[PDB]
Design an enzyme around this catalytic site. Sequence first.
Site, short mmCIF file in Angstrom:
data_model
loop_
_atom_site.label_atom_id
_atom_site.label_comp_id
_atom_site.label_asym_id
_atom_site.label_seq_id
_atom_site.Cartn_x
_atom_site.Cartn_y
_atom_site.Cartn_z
N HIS A 63 0.84 -1.25 0.09
CA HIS A 63 -0.04 -0.07 -0.03
C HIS A 63 0.96 1.31 -0.05
O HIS A 63 0.64 2.19 -0.67
CB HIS A 63 -0.98 -0.15 1.20
CG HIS A 63 -2.04 0.86 1.18
ND1 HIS A 63 -1.97 2.09 1.42
CD2 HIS A 63 -3.22 0.65 0.70
CE1 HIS A 63 -3.20 2.76 1.49
NE2 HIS A 63 -3.92 1.73 1.00
N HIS A 64 1.90 1.24 0.98
CA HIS A 64 2.65 2.53 0.94
C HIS A 64 4.04 1.72 1.48
O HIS A 64 4.08 0.65 2.15
CB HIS A 64 1.93 3.62 1.91
CG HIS A 64 2.30 3.75 3.14
ND1 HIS A 64 1.27 3.30 4.23
CD2 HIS A 64 3.27 4.00 4.14
CE1 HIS A 64 1.72 3.17 5.33
NE2 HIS A 64 2.96 3.78 5.49
N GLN A 126 9.91 1.09 6.28
CA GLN A 126 8.51 0.56 6.52
C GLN A 126 7.73 0.30 5.21
O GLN A 126 7.71 1.00 4.10
CB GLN A 126 7.69 1.77 7.40
CG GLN A 126 6.24 1.32 7.66
CD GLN A 126 5.50 2.71 8.47
OE1 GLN A 126 4.58 3.03 7.81
NE2 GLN A 126 5.97 2.84 9.44
N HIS A 128 4.07 -0.91 4.23
CA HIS A 128 2.56 -1.32 4.79
C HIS A 128 1.87 -2.17 3.64
O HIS A 128 1.66 -1.57 2.48
CB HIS A 128 1.80 0.10 5.21
CG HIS A 128 0.45 -0.02 5.26
ND1 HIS A 128 -0.58 0.72 4.32
CD2 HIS A 128 -0.20 -0.68 6.12
CE1 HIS A 128 -1.85 -0.02 4.83
NE2 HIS A 128 -1.54 -0.51 5.91
N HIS A 198 -0.05 13.64 8.12
CA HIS A 198 -0.38 12.59 8.62
C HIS A 198 -1.16 12.97 9.83
O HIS A 198 -0.69 13.70 10.79
CB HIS A 198 0.76 11.79 9.05
CG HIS A 198 0.49 10.67 9.98
ND1 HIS A 198 0.15 9.50 9.23
CD2 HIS A 198 0.59 10.39 11.28
CE1 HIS A 198 0.02 8.51 10.11
NE2 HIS A 198 0.28 8.93 11.31
N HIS A 200 -4.73 10.31 12.09
CA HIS A 200 -5.36 9.22 11.79
C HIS A 200 -6.89 9.32 11.27
O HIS A 200 -6.92 10.29 10.60
CB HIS A 200 -5.36 8.42 13.17
CG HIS A 200 -4.01 7.89 13.74
ND1 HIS A 200 -3.90 7.73 14.87
CD2 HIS A 200 -2.86 8.04 12.97
CE1 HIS A 200 -2.41 7.88 15.37
NE2 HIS A 200 -1.99 7.90 14.20
N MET A 270 -3.14 12.38 15.96
CA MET A 270 -2.03 13.06 15.96
C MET A 270 -2.18 14.03 14.82
O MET A 270 -2.78 13.71 13.78
CB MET A 270 -0.91 12.21 15.61
CG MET A 270 -0.64 11.08 14.81
SD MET A 270 0.79 9.80 14.72
CE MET A 270 1.36 10.26 16.50
CU LIG Z 1 -0.71 2.55 3.39
CU LIG Z 2 0.37 8.26 13.20
#
Ligand SMILES: [Cu+2]
Ligand SMILES: [Cu+2]
Length: 311
Positions: A63-64, A126, A128, A198, A200, A270
Amino acid sequence: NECLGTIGPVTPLDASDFALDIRMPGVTPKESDTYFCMSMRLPVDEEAFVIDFKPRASMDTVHHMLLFGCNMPSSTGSYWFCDEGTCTDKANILYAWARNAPPTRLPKGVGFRVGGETGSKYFVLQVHYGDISAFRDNHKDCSGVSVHLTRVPQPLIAGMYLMMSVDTVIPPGEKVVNADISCQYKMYPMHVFAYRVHTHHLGKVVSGYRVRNGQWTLIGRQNPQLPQAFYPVEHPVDVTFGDILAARCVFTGEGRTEATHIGGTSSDEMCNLYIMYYMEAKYALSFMTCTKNVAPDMFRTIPAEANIPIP
Ligand SMILES: [Cu+2]
Ligand SMILES: [Cu+2]
Protein backbone atom coordinates in the site's frame (compact mmCIF):
# COMPACT_ATOMS: atom_id res chain seq x y z
CA ASN A 1 18.25 -13.55 -1.15
CA GLU A 2 14.93 -14.78 0.13
CA CYS A 3 12.97 -14.13 -3.13
CA LEU A 4 15.90 -15.39 -5.25
CA GLY A 5 17.21 -11.86 -6.06
CA THR A 6 20.92 -11.82 -6.88
CA ILE A 7 21.61 -8.09 -5.99
CA GLY A 8 23.90 -7.56 -2.99
CA PRO A 9 23.03 -5.11 -0.29
CA VAL A 10 25.71 -2.71 -1.77
CA THR A 11 26.56 -2.20 -5.39
CA PRO A 12 29.36 0.22 -6.29
CA LEU A 13 28.28 2.28 -9.34
CA ASP A 14 31.60 3.96 -10.23
CA ALA A 15 34.27 5.56 -8.15
CA SER A 16 32.15 7.75 -5.90
CA ASP A 17 28.66 6.21 -5.89
CA PHE A 18 26.83 3.10 -4.75
CA ALA A 19 23.33 1.71 -4.55
CA LEU A 20 21.83 0.20 -1.40
CA ASP A 21 19.11 -2.39 -1.99
CA ILE A 22 16.80 -2.22 1.02
CA ARG A 23 14.35 -5.12 0.74
CA MET A 24 12.19 -7.00 3.28
CA PRO A 25 13.64 -10.46 4.18
CA GLY A 26 11.00 -12.80 2.64
CA VAL A 27 8.17 -11.65 4.96
CA THR A 28 4.71 -13.13 4.98
CA PRO A 29 1.94 -10.70 5.95
CA LYS A 30 -0.76 -12.95 7.47
CA GLU A 31 -3.30 -10.22 7.98
CA SER A 32 -4.54 -7.15 6.12
CA ASP A 33 -3.07 -3.78 7.14
CA THR A 34 0.24 -4.98 8.42
CA TYR A 35 3.24 -2.74 9.01
CA PHE A 36 6.58 -4.49 8.74
CA CYS A 37 9.84 -2.67 9.41
CA MET A 38 13.49 -3.47 8.81
CA SER A 39 16.78 -1.56 9.17
CA MET A 40 19.91 -1.23 6.98
CA ARG A 41 23.09 0.29 8.31
CA LEU A 42 25.08 2.60 6.14
CA PRO A 43 28.14 0.65 4.85
CA VAL A 44 30.34 3.83 4.90
CA ASP A 45 31.13 5.79 8.02
CA GLU A 46 32.01 9.02 6.19
CA GLU A 47 29.15 11.26 5.16
CA ALA A 48 27.26 10.41 1.97
CA PHE A 49 24.37 11.84 0.00
CA VAL A 50 21.12 10.20 -0.91
CA ILE A 51 20.30 11.53 -4.42
CA ASP A 52 17.74 9.13 -5.86
CA PHE A 53 15.39 6.31 -5.05
CA LYS A 54 13.80 3.42 -6.97
CA PRO A 55 10.80 1.58 -5.46
CA ARG A 56 10.44 -2.23 -5.58
CA ALA A 57 6.89 -2.82 -4.35
CA SER A 58 4.78 -5.95 -4.78
CA MET A 59 1.92 -4.18 -6.52
CA ASP A 60 -0.53 -6.87 -5.42
CA THR A 61 -0.21 -6.07 -1.76
CA VAL A 62 1.94 -3.13 -0.88
CA HIS A 63 0.00 0.00 0.00
CA HIS A 64 2.75 2.37 1.02
CA MET A 65 6.47 2.32 1.92
CA LEU A 66 8.35 4.85 4.00
CA LEU A 67 12.13 5.24 4.40
CA PHE A 68 13.67 6.96 7.44
CA GLY A 69 17.20 7.67 8.64
CA CYS A 70 18.08 7.36 12.30
CA ASN A 71 20.72 6.17 14.76
CA MET A 72 18.57 3.99 17.09
CA PRO A 73 16.27 1.62 15.15
CA SER A 74 13.61 0.01 17.35
CA SER A 75 14.88 -3.55 16.80
CA THR A 76 18.06 -5.33 15.67
CA GLY A 77 16.12 -8.32 14.27
CA SER A 78 15.78 -9.09 10.57
CA TYR A 79 12.32 -7.47 10.70
CA TRP A 80 9.57 -6.38 13.06
CA PHE A 81 6.04 -5.14 13.47
CA CYS A 82 6.30 -1.35 13.16
CA ASP A 83 3.65 -0.84 15.79
CA GLU A 84 6.64 -1.58 18.20
CA GLY A 85 8.42 1.58 16.96
CA THR A 86 10.39 2.85 13.97
CA CYS A 87 13.46 4.15 15.79
CA THR A 88 13.71 4.71 19.60
CA ASP A 89 15.30 8.01 18.60
CA LYS A 90 14.07 10.51 16.07
CA ALA A 91 13.13 9.05 12.69
CA ASN A 92 13.86 11.41 9.88
CA ILE A 93 11.74 10.75 6.83
CA LEU A 94 13.58 10.50 3.50
CA TYR A 95 11.06 8.97 1.14
CA ALA A 96 7.49 7.84 0.77
CA TRP A 97 5.98 5.64 -1.85
CA ALA A 98 2.26 5.27 -2.24
CA ARG A 99 0.52 3.02 -4.76
CA ASN A 100 -1.83 5.72 -6.19
CA ALA A 101 0.16 8.83 -5.44
CA PRO A 102 3.55 8.36 -7.18
CA PRO A 103 6.70 9.98 -5.63
CA THR A 104 8.38 12.98 -7.23
CA ARG A 105 12.09 12.90 -7.92
CA LEU A 106 14.55 14.97 -5.86
CA PRO A 107 15.40 18.28 -7.54
CA LYS A 108 18.74 18.21 -9.38
CA GLY A 109 21.71 18.89 -7.07
CA VAL A 110 19.68 17.95 -4.02
CA GLY A 111 20.66 15.19 -1.64
CA PHE A 112 19.96 14.15 1.92
CA ARG A 113 23.09 13.68 3.94
CA VAL A 114 23.70 10.64 6.03
CA GLY A 115 26.74 9.26 7.82
CA GLY A 116 29.48 11.47 9.13
CA GLU A 117 29.18 13.32 12.41
CA THR A 118 25.70 14.62 12.09
CA GLY A 119 23.95 12.07 9.84
CA SER A 120 21.92 8.96 10.21
CA LYS A 121 23.79 5.69 10.54
CA TYR A 122 20.76 3.51 9.61
CA PHE A 123 17.87 3.42 7.20
CA VAL A 124 14.64 2.07 8.49
CA LEU A 125 12.16 0.86 5.96
CA GLN A 126 8.44 0.65 6.62
CA VAL A 127 6.32 -1.44 4.23
CA HIS A 128 2.58 -1.27 4.84
CA TYR A 129 0.60 -4.17 3.39
CA GLY A 130 -3.07 -3.46 2.60
CA ASP A 131 -5.78 -6.09 2.12
CA ILE A 132 -4.03 -9.35 1.32
CA SER A 133 -5.43 -12.35 -0.54
CA ALA A 134 -6.50 -15.41 1.36
CA PHE A 135 -4.25 -18.37 0.49
CA ARG A 136 -1.07 -16.31 0.74
CA ASP A 137 0.27 -17.14 4.19
CA ASN A 138 3.33 -18.94 2.91
CA HIS A 139 4.32 -16.32 0.24
CA LYS A 140 7.65 -14.59 0.87
CA ASP A 141 7.85 -10.87 0.06
CA CYS A 142 10.95 -8.71 -0.50
CA SER A 143 9.41 -5.34 -1.20
CA GLY A 144 11.44 -2.23 -0.60
CA VAL A 145 13.58 0.44 -2.24
CA SER A 146 16.95 0.94 -3.95
CA VAL A 147 18.81 4.01 -2.82
CA HIS A 148 21.38 5.92 -4.87
CA LEU A 149 24.16 7.18 -2.53
CA THR A 150 27.10 9.32 -3.52
CA ARG A 151 30.11 10.57 -1.58
CA VAL A 152 30.33 13.59 -3.93
CA PRO A 153 29.30 16.61 -1.77
CA GLN A 154 25.93 17.96 -3.02
CA PRO A 155 25.42 21.78 -3.36
CA LEU A 156 21.96 21.63 -1.83
CA ILE A 157 21.04 19.48 1.17
CA ALA A 158 17.50 18.24 1.75
CA GLY A 159 16.00 17.83 5.21
CA MET A 160 12.63 17.79 6.95
CA TYR A 161 10.82 20.49 8.90
CA LEU A 162 8.45 18.55 11.17
CA MET A 163 5.40 20.42 12.53
CA MET A 164 3.43 18.60 15.18
CA SER A 165 0.44 19.51 17.34
CA VAL A 166 0.40 18.34 20.98
CA ASP A 167 -1.76 20.91 22.87
CA THR A 168 -5.26 20.26 21.42
CA VAL A 169 -8.10 17.94 22.51
CA ILE A 170 -11.09 16.92 20.30
CA PRO A 171 -14.36 17.10 22.29
CA PRO A 172 -16.76 14.33 21.42
CA GLY A 173 -19.30 15.18 18.68
CA GLU A 174 -17.76 18.55 17.95
CA LYS A 175 -18.16 18.98 14.20
CA VAL A 176 -14.95 20.75 13.29
CA VAL A 177 -11.90 21.16 15.54
CA ASN A 178 -8.82 23.00 14.40
CA ALA A 179 -5.30 22.22 15.71
CA ASP A 180 -2.98 25.15 14.98
CA ILE A 181 0.86 24.99 14.99
CA SER A 182 3.21 27.95 14.60
CA CYS A 183 6.97 28.70 15.02
CA GLN A 184 9.25 31.55 14.10
CA TYR A 185 11.94 30.53 11.60
CA LYS A 186 15.48 31.52 12.38
CA MET A 187 17.93 29.71 10.21
CA TYR A 188 19.40 30.25 6.76
CA PRO A 189 16.90 29.94 3.89
CA MET A 190 15.17 26.64 3.31
CA HIS A 191 13.15 26.07 0.17
CA VAL A 192 10.20 23.68 0.46
CA PHE A 193 9.73 21.40 -2.49
CA ALA A 194 7.46 18.71 -1.00
CA TYR A 195 5.19 17.89 1.91
CA ARG A 196 3.28 14.97 3.38
CA VAL A 197 0.51 15.13 6.00
CA HIS A 198 -0.42 12.63 8.65
CA THR A 199 -3.34 12.18 11.03
CA HIS A 200 -5.42 9.06 11.78
CA HIS A 201 -9.12 8.58 11.03
CA LEU A 202 -10.50 11.86 12.34
CA GLY A 203 -8.26 14.13 10.23
CA LYS A 204 -10.14 16.08 7.54
CA VAL A 205 -7.40 18.23 6.05
CA VAL A 206 -3.98 19.58 6.83
CA SER A 207 -2.43 22.80 5.47
CA GLY A 208 0.96 24.45 5.81
CA TYR A 209 1.87 28.13 5.29
CA ARG A 210 4.77 30.57 5.32
CA VAL A 211 3.73 33.85 6.91
CA ARG A 212 5.99 36.84 6.12
CA ASN A 213 4.96 40.29 7.43
CA GLY A 214 1.43 39.01 7.93
CA GLN A 215 1.03 37.64 4.39
CA TRP A 216 0.33 33.86 4.09
CA THR A 217 1.82 31.70 1.29
CA LEU A 218 0.47 28.21 0.94
CA ILE A 219 3.09 25.49 1.20
CA GLY A 220 0.55 22.78 0.73
CA ARG A 221 -2.83 21.36 1.65
CA GLN A 222 -4.03 17.72 1.53
CA ASN A 223 -6.59 15.38 3.02
CA PRO A 224 -4.70 12.91 5.31
CA GLN A 225 -7.03 10.04 4.25
CA LEU A 226 -5.70 10.19 0.67
CA PRO A 227 -2.35 8.32 0.20
CA GLN A 228 0.28 10.00 2.39
CA ALA A 229 2.96 10.30 -0.26
CA PHE A 230 5.10 13.42 -0.56
CA TYR A 231 3.12 15.82 -2.58
CA PRO A 232 5.21 18.14 -4.69
CA VAL A 233 5.29 21.87 -4.16
CA GLU A 234 4.72 23.20 -7.67
CA HIS A 235 6.85 26.30 -6.95
CA PRO A 236 9.23 25.78 -4.05
CA VAL A 237 8.46 28.20 -1.23
CA ASP A 238 11.43 29.99 0.26
CA VAL A 239 11.31 30.32 4.04
CA THR A 240 13.83 32.65 5.75
CA PHE A 241 14.89 34.24 9.12
CA GLY A 242 11.84 36.15 10.44
CA ASP A 243 9.10 34.09 8.65
CA ILE A 244 6.58 32.12 10.64
CA LEU A 245 5.63 28.58 9.69
CA ALA A 246 1.96 28.00 10.44
CA ALA A 247 -0.11 24.85 10.06
CA ARG A 248 -3.78 23.92 10.64
CA CYS A 249 -5.21 20.45 10.96
CA VAL A 250 -8.97 20.21 10.79
CA PHE A 251 -10.46 17.32 12.77
CA THR A 252 -13.93 15.88 13.36
CA GLY A 253 -15.18 14.59 16.72
CA GLU A 254 -18.30 13.25 14.98
CA GLY A 255 -19.18 9.71 16.12
CA ARG A 256 -16.78 9.73 19.10
CA THR A 257 -17.66 8.93 22.70
CA GLU A 258 -14.89 10.60 24.74
CA ALA A 259 -12.44 13.45 24.10
CA THR A 260 -9.58 12.59 21.75
CA HIS A 261 -6.11 13.96 22.47
CA ILE A 262 -4.16 15.08 19.38
CA GLY A 263 -0.49 14.32 19.98
CA GLY A 264 1.33 12.34 22.66
CA THR A 265 -0.53 9.94 24.98
CA SER A 266 0.59 8.06 21.96
CA SER A 267 -3.18 7.75 21.69
CA ASP A 268 -5.76 7.94 18.94
CA GLU A 269 -4.99 11.23 17.10
CA MET A 270 -1.96 13.09 15.87
CA CYS A 271 -1.23 15.91 13.43
CA ASN A 272 2.06 15.93 11.64
CA LEU A 273 3.02 18.03 8.56
CA TYR A 274 6.24 16.88 6.85
CA ILE A 275 7.80 19.86 5.12
CA MET A 276 10.59 18.69 2.84
CA TYR A 277 13.14 21.39 2.01
CA TYR A 278 16.64 21.99 0.70
CA MET A 279 19.29 24.40 1.98
CA GLU A 280 22.53 25.61 0.47
CA ALA A 281 24.97 22.99 1.66
CA LYS A 282 27.21 25.12 3.95
CA TYR A 283 24.27 26.52 5.94
CA ALA A 284 22.19 23.33 5.90
CA LEU A 285 20.80 21.24 8.69
CA SER A 286 18.95 18.01 8.11
CA PHE A 287 15.93 18.64 10.28
CA MET A 288 13.96 21.06 12.33
CA THR A 289 10.81 20.73 14.41
CA CYS A 290 7.95 22.98 15.54
CA THR A 291 5.79 21.66 18.44
CA LYS A 292 4.05 24.72 19.62
CA ASN A 293 1.78 27.55 18.60
CA VAL A 294 3.79 30.73 19.40
CA ALA A 295 1.41 32.99 17.52
CA PRO A 296 -2.18 31.74 17.96
CA ASP A 297 -3.38 35.33 17.40
CA MET A 298 -2.43 34.94 13.69
CA PHE A 299 -4.98 32.29 12.83
CA ARG A 300 -7.76 34.85 13.10
CA THR A 301 -6.44 36.17 9.73
CA ILE A 302 -5.81 32.70 8.18
CA PRO A 303 -6.77 32.39 4.47
CA ALA A 304 -10.20 30.93 4.11
CA GLU A 305 -8.82 28.15 1.80
CA ALA A 306 -7.12 26.64 4.88
CA ASN A 307 -10.58 25.71 6.08
CA ILE A 308 -11.96 24.13 2.86
CA PRO A 309 -12.63 20.40 2.89
CA ILE A 310 -10.74 18.28 0.47
CA PRO A 311 -13.07 15.24 0.47
CU1 LIG B 1 -0.55 2.44 3.27
CU1 LIG C 1 0.25 8.01 13.27
